[PDB]
Design a protein around this ligand. Sequence first.
Ligand SMILES: O[C@@H]1[C@@H](O)[C@H](O)OC[C@H]1O
Ligand code: NI
Length: 376
Amino acid sequence: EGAFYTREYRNLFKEFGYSEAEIQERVKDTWEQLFGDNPETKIYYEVGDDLGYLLDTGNLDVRTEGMSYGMMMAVQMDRKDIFDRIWNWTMKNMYMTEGVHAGYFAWSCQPDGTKNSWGPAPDGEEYFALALFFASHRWGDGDEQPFNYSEQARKLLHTCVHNGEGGPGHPMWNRDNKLIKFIPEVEFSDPSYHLPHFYELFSLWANEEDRVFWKEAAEASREYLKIACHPETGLAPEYAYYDGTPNDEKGYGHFFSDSYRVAANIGLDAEWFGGSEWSAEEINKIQAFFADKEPEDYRRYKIDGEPFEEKSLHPVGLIATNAMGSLASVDGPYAKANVDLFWNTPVRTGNRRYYDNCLYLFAMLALSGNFKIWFP
Ligand SMILES: O[C@@H]1[C@@H](O)[C@H](O)OC[C@H]1O
Ligand code: NI
């Protein structure tokens, strides 16, 4: 039974022989390297006395993906000051009050706050919402907006499901199949975007009129992942049609950057809401596929396993996600090897560190039993 029921979180590092002391030190060090004053590795930048943001070092922009990640990270680390700085920046510079996407958040902004687009990224919206629910539960709803956390979360999720009824907007979930979409105006998805465990919680805290829908979304996402992941390799494409097959129209139909998060999501869902036969077997397939492969040689692969000449742009993130997946198969034949590989992998430096490091800290929290559900 998941931690949702027991309220006890598995410390996989510890179960695999690591000392509690070293684990505690490592988790804190990972945090400082990302949010502290460590230019070579940090991804979080403070601005003034009330603003802050995560920088996509590789594209020199601020993404809701990063901001939502930063907020989730801050609440897990019980750092309201960081959470508030980031959320404040998001509402001030990313929240859109105009255009067909009003009510959502511009997916990419320049460091000075200027919007690069008026299009949103659904995976950011879903992270903002849960992060906000957790903030409300850990610290309580702030008196002045937009710090009225739970109200902002329910408000945002309302838009995500009902947008397009009272106007020209589009919902972020297809109302018929209950599946999250790549972006509001398309009818296809992105496997890494599916977070059944997040929806389960939304089915408890979102507006009551949508609680049934969210329970249905969680179930729909679990089924979706079964058809999206290759049956032999376990690899999922970055983009995929609702039918499950890859959408390679623009080159996103293979196993690359986006895809890595699938294994992490499966792991966290298993820890929160319980393991499943499918999840364990899925992780065993992915890890098995990488068992005879060296990090320095990780490539972009077709989901059937065929290798491209191109190397993985974020091999450290891949390592972190495969390790985090071990939560869905603690007795798997490669579980220990993956956790050890991650432990022996340093936080990344360079202009491509952003994505790797985000996946890195999430894996560190989850594997140490510190990526928890915060109840009212
Ligand atoms: O924003 C991320 C980008 O920084 C990385 O390079 O590829 C995956 C994206 O999600
Ligand atoms: Ni030590």
